[PDB]
């Protein structure tokens, strides 16, 4: 806005898994106001995550996010008759947002049948550094680390 | 017994409760058993007209029509009172039923 | 009139014009404006000049058009093609 920053909304702790990271995942899965539907998908995929490791699922979730959080994004800027990308530093609570969007997004177009086994397989493949969500992490990094020459115009 | 049921209706506020209070005060002076003015919910009739006489659909008015109801009193049908129940001139904007 | 409880619908001024010809067995044409009338199996063999909007169109009730309305054989609109 013209008049400075807006207050951001607090997320209440998730009752089944006592963490605000789970309730920040259910709002990315949420479509059309189906929040009790969106929580059955997230809870159901996290129960399937411990059925393939035995480990606690939110520890697997935080290992899955740490492999897909970007550190450098590649925002665009025009100067004269040419454009380029400036590598800028991702503030941390944007990197939480931008990584939860990649896990939900790249697993909606994944090859399984239901959304529970699509979301759970993307979490397990990201907590090992294998999935397509991990692939966009280094594609975001290789794009931004190919443009260090333009890191001197940071607004 | 307790048989007389009055059913005041009116378009406007403040011309009906004064008709209930200071005019049906003329029943307790004839020694009858009142229960008091009981307010009922208000009816609404909303109308929505186009302002322009031609081709301006997106500009509109909203007219309403409220109707107030009160005084469901169950006074004693004494034959001395039931004459004096209907002697007073109510205002023009007040309706009454004796059911 | 379109529901089986109340029968079919033929205009009464059209029923009198064929009952004066079914009694003496002639086949004169019936100039009419009643497009809304049902064809019933007493119109068989009769011909009808049926108004379409601008003129009267002959129609010959044979046997198989006997559940239809009479206006279905005089087309009102006209379209030969755009080019």
């Amino acid at each position: 806005p013209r008049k400075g920053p807006a207050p951001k909304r607090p997320l209440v702790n998730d009752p089944v898994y006592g963490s605000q990271l789970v309730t920040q995942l259910v709002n990315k899965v949420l479509l059309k106001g189906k929040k009790s539907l969106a929580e059955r998908i997230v809870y159901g995929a996290l129960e399937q995550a411990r059925d393939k490791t035995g480990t606690d699922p939110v520890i697997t979730l935080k290992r899955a996010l740490d492999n897909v959080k970007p550190a450098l994004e590649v925002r665009s800027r025009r100067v004269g008759g040419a454009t380029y990308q400036v590598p800028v530093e991702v503030r941390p609570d944007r990197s939480t947002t931008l990584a939860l969007r990649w896990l939900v997004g790249y697993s909606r177009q994944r090859r399984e049948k239901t959304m529970i086994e699509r979301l759970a397989n993307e979490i397990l493949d990201a907590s090992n550094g294998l999935g397509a969500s991990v692939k966009r992490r280094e594609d975001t990094h290789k794009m931004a680390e190919a443009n260090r020459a333009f890191a001197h115009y940071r607004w | 017994g307790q048989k007389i049921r009055i059913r005041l209706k009116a378009y406007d506020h403040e011309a009906i409760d004064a008709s209930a209070r200071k005019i049906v005060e003329t029943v307790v002076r004839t020694g009858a058993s009142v229960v008091g003015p009981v307010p009922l919910p208000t009816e609404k009739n909303v109308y929505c007209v186009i302002r322009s006489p031609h081709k301006y659909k997106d500009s509109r008015e909203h007219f309403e029509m409220r109707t107030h109801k009160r005084l469901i009193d169950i006074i004693d049908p004494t034959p001395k009172t039931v004459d004096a129940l209907m002697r007073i001139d109510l205002p023009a904007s007040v309706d009454v039923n004796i059911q | 009139p379109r529901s089986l409880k109340k029968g079919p619908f033929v205009d009464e001024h059209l029923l009198k014009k064929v009952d004066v010809q079914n009694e003496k067995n002639t086949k004169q044409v019936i100039k009419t404006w009643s497009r809304r009338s049902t064809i019933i199996p007493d119109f068989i063999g009769h011909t009808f000049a049926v108004h379409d909007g601008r003129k009267h169109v002959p129609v010959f009730v044979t046997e198989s058009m006997v559940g239809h309305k009479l206006g279905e054989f005089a087309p009102t609109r006209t379209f030969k093609g755009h080019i």
Partner: protein
């Protein structure tokens, strides 16, 4: 003398009759897990109780009415916190700090003429 409070959230109006006991919900003749089958709603029913730490007491019953089920859960939370004050005048700064006394006025905005919804406009299309 009986505790008589009321909470209301969007159009739900609950009537809490907080009575001391072993801790039991029978909302409108029906228990918590039989009336609210959702674990997120049940967290915020007794969220004022875990603050004051009196969840094992106070078997309540309420007259749930009006609105939808998520409005009924939030209206019940305001009913409990305003009922805990009438049994306890010392947990008031504990529940005001969490925000369990705010009625949260957030109503459905009306539909405006010329618009498809409360704020949604139709297709613009300058030519």
């Amino acid at each position: 003398r009986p505790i008589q409070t009321v909470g209301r959230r969007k159009e739900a109006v609950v009537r809490v009759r907080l009575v001391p006991g072993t801790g039991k919900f029978d909302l409108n003749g029906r228990s918590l897990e039989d009336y609210f089958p959702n674990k997120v709603h049940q967290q915020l029913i007794k969220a004022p109780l875990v603050t004051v730490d009196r969840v094992e007491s106070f078997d309540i019953f309420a007259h749930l009415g009006g609105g939808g089920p998520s409005g009924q859960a939030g209206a019940l939370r305001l009913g409990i916190a305003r009922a805990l004050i009438l049994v306890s005048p010392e947990d008031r700064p504990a529940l005001k700090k969490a925000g369990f006394l705010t009625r949260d006025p957030r109503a459905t905005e009306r539909k405006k003429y010329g618009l498809k919804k409360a704020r949604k406009a139709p297709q613009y299309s300058k030519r």
